[PDB]
Every structure is written in C-alpha cells, then in structure tokens.
Design a protein around this ligand. Structure first.
Ligand SMILES: CC(=O)SCCNC(=O)CCNC(=O)[C@H](O)C(C)(C)COP(=O)(O)OP(=O)(O)OC[C@H]1O[C@@H](n2cnc3c(N)ncnc32)[C@H](O)[C@@H]1OP(=O)(O)O
Lengths: 185, 185
C-alpha cells in the first residue's frame, strides 16, 4: 500500500522514542548505546524542527505511528548549511513494505523544495538494506570508513553516501533566504 | 629543524584563538564563518581536554605559540569511542617548516598510546596540501564529498581520510579502560 506520511507533532513522541529505542538496543543503524528518554527525544525534535528541517512520520491503517524520518545538519558549521543528512527509522513490523523508500523520497523532495543542495547518508554498519534503499533513490556511495564503530561486540564499518538536491552545485545559492539563513552569527 | 611541541595550557588560548581566527577568515580548512571568541575557544579546549584527548601547541624559538593541534571525537556517540578526528592549524609563519608533520605525528602517537584504534581527517576544501600532509603520515583517501561546503562564494569539496591506530581492527578493545570508558551512560 502507498505509505501514509505526515509531519511529526509532539503527540508522536512516545512512538518515536520507542522506535528509536528498539534501534538503539538491537541494531547498528545508530551508534548510540543508551536509549534516549522521551524528554531528550523532545529536545532533539524541537531542535531539528526549529531549524526548519522536515520531520515526518509514517502511519499504519489505524493512524498509528510506525516509522519516522528527518533531515538535519551533517555538522552545524556555517559552510555546511546547504548540506543535510537523512535519518530513517521503522518499527520492525513496518519494515519490508516500501515505507523506507516513501520516507526517503519525502525527505529528498522536501529538502529540494526547501533549497538544500546536497544530502548525505551516514549508514551505520554499512547495512546492506540501507545502502540499497539509498542507491534506489539516486545516492552514490562515496566512501567506507572501516572499523569506525564498535557495538554488539564487533567492529563496524560506516558507509557514506551522497545525493545532489535540486540544482546541486550548478548554481550559487539564493542569498538571504532559507537555508542560506542557517548557522549565521 | 625538529619542531618544538608541548601540551597546550590555558595561557595559550589567546594565541590559539588568533591562529584560528586567521584560518576562519582566510582559509577553508574550517567551515566556521565567524571567528570564535577566546572565551568560546577556551570552552572548547576545556571540553576536548576534559574528555582525555591530546591538545598540543608548536612553538617558535622564543617559545611563542605558532600552531596547534588536537584530537577529538568524530561524533560523540558510544560506538565511535575508538575513533578520533585530527584538527591542525598553523599560523602563516609556521607553514613550510615540517611543523604540520610534527603536530600530526604527535596526535597519531598520542592517540596510539591512549588506545584509540582509527583516526579520521575531514579536510575542508579538499586542499591538496592538507591531503598530502595526511598521506605522508599514512592516511589514505576514503572519499570526496563534493560541493558540501559553501564559503567565500564557492562550492567546496570535503575530503575524508583515515589511518588505523595501533592494533586497529585486529583485536577487540580492552573493556573498562580508556577510551572504552568514553561516552558510556
Ligand atoms: C541513513 C539512514 O537512516 S539508513 C536507515 C537506518 N535505520 C535503520 O536501520 C532502522 C531499521 N530499519 C529500517 O527502519 C528499515 O528497514 C530501513 C529504513 C533500513 C529500510 O526501509 P524498509 O522500508 O524496510 O525497506 P526494505 O524492505 O528494503 O528493507 C529490508 C530490511 O527490512 C527487514 N524486514 C522486512 N520485513 C520485516 C519484518 N516484518 N520485521 C522485521 N524486519 C523486517 C529485512 O529483513 C531487511 O533487513 P535486513 O537486510 O537486515 O535483513
């Protein structure tokens, strides 16, 4: 079924927190070890959305949140302001249903519309399903940082992939409008 | 001539701040746009050194600070705790004298002794001179993230390089001794 997506709101916090918790504990998509609290997750949500970045949820047929995705800074230094990084997390039972691709497509589309110019994915563990998802939406593998993570008793590689957004490098950004207005002080 | 290095102390912050300011304003090694104040640099120094990472200066023949370098996290998430990233800043007068090599040698050696297992360099602008410095110290180019920075009116590439440290990926780290103790909670 075509996925059901909408922007995240505060009321989605429990589901977001629990989905992320499961990934923290069981996976290598995230290199965090201790699940954040809901209050920490709330700070992160407020920070991401306060910077104008998209933060979306996927819903099941009853309207319940079953996955989420957001864009944020790669690094919040000024010169990186036209670059975003994607993060995508689905609850286990929502996997294998095309929802990851819907979420990534949504982040790509939103960030293009908003005026960003490049997107990077930092793929924990170089997880093959995650690489495949990104490749299908036009990301290219840029490097493999070997044995950079250590989790679940093993060394992990970290893959870096990139996709241009919109005009990419072909034009200069529009001065004085979002996202050129990010990280200026 | 052999470089004169020592660990940084609080009394070096004024000089460190001035060196970094020149880099912020005139270079693309750093993607920061506004020079930090000495107070801000001092907080950064406190944080880096509070995490046990090495922070060093290079001196001229009279003892004045003419460059500095430190290791710190690539990202401060648990699974990255055995990975460090190097940062090196030379005043204009310190360039072309083997001082970058000495600083990087010190970071590599220190982080090897401390028990880190990989070092990454994230090279702003992909400047060939910085790439070559790192290559000379055994780093290999891992990828080039194109048009990821925008500074001084230009799209900038960002190069990623990596060197193993010590045992690298060949052994599991010893539990409960630094740097296994970083970022745990
Ligand atoms: C930069 C990034 O954010 S990369 C994504 C990082 N996030 C995660 O890894 C979180 C956990 N995984 C997920 O959220 C998703 O599976 C994604 C985002 C990686 C991919 O989106 P999906 O819509 O599942 O796409 P797709 O069907 O192609 O995924 C196949 C993966 O889901 C697993 N899967 C499929 N159906 C199920 C199910 N019912 N229960 C549990 N797992 C399932 C598959 O086994 C496979 O994972 P594997 O390669 O480890 O075996």
């Amino acid at each position: 079924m075509t996925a059901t997506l909408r922007d995240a709101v505060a009321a989605d916090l429990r589901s977001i927190t629990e989905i992320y918790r499961e990934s923290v504990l069981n996976g290598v998509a995230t290199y965090e070890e201790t699940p954040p609290s809901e209050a920490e997750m709330a700070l992160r949500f407020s920070t991401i959305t306060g910077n104008g970045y998209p933060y979306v949820v996927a819903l099941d047929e009853r309207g319940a949140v079953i996955g989420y995705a957001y864009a944020s800074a790669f690094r919040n230094r000024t010169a990186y302001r036209f670059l975003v990084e994607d993060s995508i997390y689905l609850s286990p039972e929502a996997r294998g249903k095309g929802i990851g691709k819907a979420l990534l497509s949504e982040l790509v589309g939103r960030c293009t519309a908003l005026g960003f110019r490049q997107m990077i994915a930092v793929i924990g563990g170089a997880h093959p399903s995650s690489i495949a998802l990104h490749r299908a939406l036009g990301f290219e593998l840029q490097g493999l940082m070997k044995a950079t993570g250590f989790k679940h008793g093993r060394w992990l590689d970290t893959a870096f992939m990139q996709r241009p957004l919109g005009e990419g490098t072909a034009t200069k950004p529009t001065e004085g409008v979002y996202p050129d207005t990010l990280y200026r002080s």
